[PDB]
Amino acid sequence: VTMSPESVVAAAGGGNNNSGYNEPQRFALVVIAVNHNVIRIMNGSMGFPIL
Amino acid sequence: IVLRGPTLAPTLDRTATHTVTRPRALGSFHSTAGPAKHAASIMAECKDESR
After folding, report:
1. Contacts of A49 in chain B (CB under 8 A)
2. What is the DSSP letter of A45?
3. Which residues are paired to A42 by β-bridges?
4. What are phi and psi of B7, to 5 degrees?
5. A45:B28 CB<8 A
6. Residue A13 · residue A23 · CB < 8 Å
7. Which of B20, B22, B25 has its CB closest to that of A51?
8. Torsions phi, psi of A9, nearest 5?
9. Residue A47 exposed, middle or buried by CB count within 10 Å (0-12, 13-18, 19+)
């Protein structure tokens, strides 16, 4: 991932009043994935047949 | 006198009886093995300059 000049200039402080970037800003990256699974029901029990 | 469909409550069955909890299936995927071996170094028994 490539950042932006706006991000690199807002990372430092120097912003005026009611600017949001008056204080130094810190950022984090989050990644989510949605996957498939199979559940087997037998003998009154629930468990993954493939783990 | 009032007539209506009689209310019948199903019965029997069994709930929360003799918990077992054995659904796990062993097995996983990872590396196979490693092809590494070594010899018994090198011996040296020679002197006297026998040509």
Report:
1. 25
2. E
3. A45
4. -90, 120
5. no
6. yes
7. B25
8. -85, -25
9. middle
